[PDB]
Amino acid sequence: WKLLSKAQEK
């Protein structure tokens, strides 16, 4: 999930 992957996609 984007909101869950955003942590590594900053």
- Cα gap 5→3, rounded to integer Å: 6
- Which amino acid would we find at residue 6? K
Identify how the structure was determined: NMR
Q: DSSP secondary structure string, 1-10?
A: -HHHHTTT--
- Cα gap 2→10, rounded to integer Å: 11
- Cα gap 10→3, rounded to integer Å: 11
- Cα gap 2→8, rounded to integer Å: 10
- Which amino acid would we find at residue 2? K
- Cα gap 3→6, rounded to integer Å: 5
Tell me which residue has tokens 């900053």: 10
